[PDB]
From a paper:
The PWWP domain comprises 100–130 amine acids and is often present in chromatin-associated proteins. Our structures revealed that the overall fold of the PWWP domain consists of three motifs: a canonical β-barrel core, an insertion motif between the second and third β-strands and a C-terminal α-helix bundle.
In order to explore the functional roles of the PWWP domains, we determined the crystal structures of the PWWP domains from 7 different human proteins, namely, BRPF1 (bromodomain and PHD finger-containing protein 1), BRPF2, BRPF3, MUM1 (melanoma associated antigen (mutated) 1), DNMT3A, DNMT3B and HDGF2 (Hepatoma-derived growth factor 2). By fluorescence polarization assay, we found that the PWWP domains in BRPF1, BRPF2, HDGF2, MUM1 and the N-terminal PWWP domains of WHSC1 and WHSC1L1 show weak binding affinity to histones with H3K36, K3K79 or H4K20 methylation.
Author numbering: 409 to 530
Amino acid sequence: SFEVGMLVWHKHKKYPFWPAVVKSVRQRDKKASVLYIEGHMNPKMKGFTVSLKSLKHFDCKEKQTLLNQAREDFNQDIGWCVSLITDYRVRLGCGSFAGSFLEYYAADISYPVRKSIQQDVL
């Protein structure tokens, strides 16, 4: 039950679970397409292929554990995710915006957050 534009976790070998957004889902044969959320991304870069079985929903019970695991070697980076996802969920929840995470990242309303990130690389 992974829908397109949903937020998920994915683990590449040797790497910790990282958040991502779903772009394609091949519902009827166990595979999906996904793109990592990270401080600087291209939201128009096509989604690399995974399998449904390997995805956790972003808001699963494991969340807090998964987020700490990432803060081991990627504190600043996992920070950049949480900033974006959190900022996106505010616009959504406080009514200021209605599109998808990727649309958030491309729109002018992400600016104030992308600025902090992009510059933090400074």
